[PDB]
Amino acid sequence: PTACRVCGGGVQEFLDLGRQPLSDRFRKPDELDDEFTYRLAVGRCDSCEMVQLTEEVPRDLMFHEVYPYHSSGSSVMREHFAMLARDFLATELTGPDPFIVEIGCNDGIMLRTIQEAGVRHLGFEPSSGVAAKAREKGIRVRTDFFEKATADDVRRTEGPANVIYAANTLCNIPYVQSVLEGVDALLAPDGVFVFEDPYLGDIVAKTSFDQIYDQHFFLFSATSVQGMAQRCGFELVDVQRLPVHGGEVRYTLARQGSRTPSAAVAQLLAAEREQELSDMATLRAFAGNVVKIRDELTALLHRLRAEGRSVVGYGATAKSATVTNFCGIGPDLVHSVYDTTPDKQNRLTPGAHIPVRPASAFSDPYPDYALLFAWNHAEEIMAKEQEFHQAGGRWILYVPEVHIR
């Protein structure tokens, strides 16, 4: 079997999503039809309750020079991060000469606000293309993975960080123990390590299995994060639920006993226990619901084809690779996917090879239906696409259930 990456306990599988391609590899249509594949399956550790994948994709296959995800492509997320950065400037970064390190800064969506406040900072961004976009904004970026050794190097040259922050990144990192030792080396004795990532609670409640793909190794909960912190010398001292990305929790870790946990921590712990969130039977029931969504979504897509209705997709999310490859959905059922990311445009989606076209191409004459892969961006997207729905075009969603509206 698989050893738990947090505690070395045994991992029990509950969901097997089969062979999957790299989720963010978009091929030109002339490229050879070969792709790396791996088995995507999810289990839960016996000892610490951490839900995690059973096969790791090597980091350098996922994060490198042409990694295509551009965080700044969403107006809602640009606002969400600017606000988080102001909240840190008002609270944890008030000292003389404060220092904030962000793990996974991407194109600088968060750090831009810190730089504009004149505060010392450093972004770690091992994907050099998006790192260069952050540096264009005047952000200080290191094109390296955060891990024990690179944290030590930053401590040596830059001194302690008052805040270490990671969004939608820590759950990507199976070497979380090395990151934690990095945090231990680098964080001020009275600092915080704050991270926010897709929440197990939301994934189980919404059956949002597309949150499981190569780059999302862990599905954190308050229960497993508390365990992970404790084992590494930290303590879970705050939690905040966030609506972004289909539902997240922002976890705040401090050195143990240095701050008193908020009431929020015990409250969420108790709700997770009450709701049996991480019980193997709950997680197996989620896995049964995942198969039901597969079966209903393919039946719908096939019925639409039989009735001569046109179907496209909207948003070439990484998540969508799980949906198209587990469900067997290709360009015979969903003809194109529309997306705002130039480096995904005029390419094929991974595994399923549906052509991706610029969102500006989604215009009159509209298709009958758009399968909404960027369902976590529904409000922002539908506000930009009122004319489609006014014209009679309808959305197909598969979270939390297959439905059309």
Ligand X SMILES: Nc1ncnc2c1ncn2[C@@H]1O[C@H](CSCC[C@H](N)C(=O)O)[C@@H](O)[C@H]1O
Residues belonging to the binding site are 4, 7, 45, 48, 69, 71, 106, 125, 127, 146, 168, 175, 213, 318-319, 339-341, 344, 376-377, 384
Decide whether 44 or 245 has the Cβ nearer to ligand X. Answer: 245
Decide whether 36 or 117 has the Cβ nearer to ligand TYD. Answer: 36
Measured distance CA(256)–CA(213) in Å, rounded = 32
CB of 106 to ligand X, least distance (A): 4
Q: Does 380 bind ligand TYD (CB under 6 A)?
A: yes
- Closest-CA residue to 71 (of 103, 105, 101, 42): 105
Measured distance CA(398)–CA(246) in Å, rounded = 12
- Closest-CA residue to 72 (of 136, 147, 164): 136
Q: Which helix (H) or strand (E) holds 357?
A: strand 355-358
User: Which partner in ligand TYD, ligand X, Zn ion, none is near 374 (CB below 5 to 8 A by kind)?
Assistant: ligand TYD
Report how far apart the first and last C-alpha atoms of the chain are (Å, whole number): 43
Decide whether 53 or 77 has the Cβ nearer to Zn ion. Answer: 53
Written as six digits, the tokens of 130 are 């998006």
Written as six digits, the tokens of 92 are 């944890």
Measured distance CA(137)–CA(115) in Å, rounded = 9
Contact letters for ligand X, residues 216-235 (x by CB under 6 A): --------------------
Q: Which helix (H) or strand (E) holds 124?
A: strand 120-124
User: Which partner in ligand TYD, Zn ion, ligand X, none is near 297 (CB below 5 to 8 A by kind)?
Assistant: none
Give the alpha-carbon dihedral of 117, 83, 246, 271, to 10 degrees: 120
Measured distance CA(152)–CA(170) in Å, rounded = 18
- Residue ranges for the known binding site for Zn(2+) are 4, 7, 45, 48
Q: Does 108 bind ligand X (CB under 6 A)?
A: no
Q: Does 48 bind Zn ion (CB under 5 A)?
A: yes
Measured distance CA(297)–CA(304) in Å, rounded = 11
Residue type for position 102: E
What percent of the chain is helix, strand and coil (3-state, nearest 5)? 40, 25, 35
Applying CB under 6 A, the span of 132-140, 142-150, 274-282, 307-315 interacting with ligand X comes to 142-150
In DSSP terms, 166 is beta-bridged to 103, 195
Q: Which of 4, 359, 371, 399 binds ligand TYD (CB under 6 A)?
A: 359
User: Which partner in ligand X, Zn ion, ligand TYD, none is near 216 (CB below 5 to 8 A by kind)?
Assistant: none
Residues that bind Zn ion (rule: CB under 5 A) add up to a total of: 8
- Closest-CA residue to 146 (of 115, 123, 118, 116): 123
Written as six digits, the tokens of 200 are 């197990």
Q: Which of 2, 9, 310, 331 binds Zn ion (CB under 5 A)?
A: 9
Q: Does 104 bind ligand X (CB under 6 A)?
A: yes
Contact letters for ligand TYD, residues 265-304 (x by CB under 6 A): ----------------------------------------
Do residues 325 and 39 touch, judged by C-beta distance below 8 A?
no
Q: Does 339 bind ligand TYD (CB under 6 A)?
A: yes
The two counts, helices (H) then strands (E), for the chain are: 13, 19
User: Which partner in ligand X, Zn ion, ligand TYD, none is near 380 (CB below 5 to 8 A by kind)?
Assistant: ligand TYD
- Closest-CA residue to 382 (of 367, 365, 395): 395
Q: Which of 21, 191, 201, 315 binds ligand TYD (CB under 6 A)?
A: 315
Return the residues of window 110-139 that contact ligand X according to CB under 6 A: 124-127, 130
Q: Which of 63, 193, 217, 326 binds ligand X (CB under 6 A)?
A: 63
- Closest-CA residue to 92 (of 135, 121, 124, 71): 121
Return the residues of window 55-94 that contact ligand TYD according to CB under 6 A: 69, 73-74
User: Which partner in ligand TYD, ligand X, Zn ion, none is near 4 (CB below 5 to 8 A by kind)?
Assistant: Zn ion
Residues binding ligand TYD (CB under 6 A): 69, 73-74, 315-319, 339-341, 344, 359, 374, 376-377, 380-381, 384
Residues binding ligand X (CB under 6 A): 63, 67, 69, 71, 103-104, 106, 109, 124-127, 130, 145-147, 167-169, 172-173
